[PDB]
Amino acid sequence: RMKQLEDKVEELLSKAYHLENEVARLKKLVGER
Amino acid sequence: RMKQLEDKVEELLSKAYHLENEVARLKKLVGER
Amino acid sequence: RMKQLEDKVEELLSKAYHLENEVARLKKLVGER
């Protein structure tokens, strides 16, 4: 039960990370914050 | 207890899934650099 | 284990929240819904 959850979380951790970078970038190809 | 976390990880999975979709769509729509 | 996981889940909750917000604004700024 433990591993699965942690497995799960590092994966989620990976996605959100990539996501922030993508948004950051989309934030420039428009009007810089 | 873990059914909890396995629940709070379940909302995150769903959150990340929609967020990924939204970001892909915009990425497409925006377009430029 | 648990303080770590539970703390990792908060990191995640934090970021999903930020991201959602950023994405939401990004969609008003470009007219997309």
**Out of A5, A9, A19, closest to residue B23 by CB:** A19
Spatial CA neighbour of B7 closest among C6, A20, C31: C6
Q: Rounded distance, CA B16 to CA B31, Å? A: 23
Q: In the PDB record, what is the listed experimental method?
A: X-ray
Tell me the residues of chain A between 9 and 28 that have a Cβ less than 8 Å away from chain B.
Answer: 9, 12, 15-16, 19, 22-23, 26, 28
Q: Which two tokens stand for residue B25?
A: 């769509």
Distance from CA of B4 to the nearest CA of C (A): 10
What is the 8-class DSSP label of residue A27? T
Q: Rounded distance, CA B3 to CA B5, Å? A: 6
The resolution of the experimental structure, rounded to one decimal in Å, is 2.0
How many residues does the structure list for chain A? 33
Q: Rounded distance, CA A30 to CA A22, Å? A: 13
Task: Please report which helix (H) or strand (E) contains residue A20, including its range.
Answer: helix A2-26
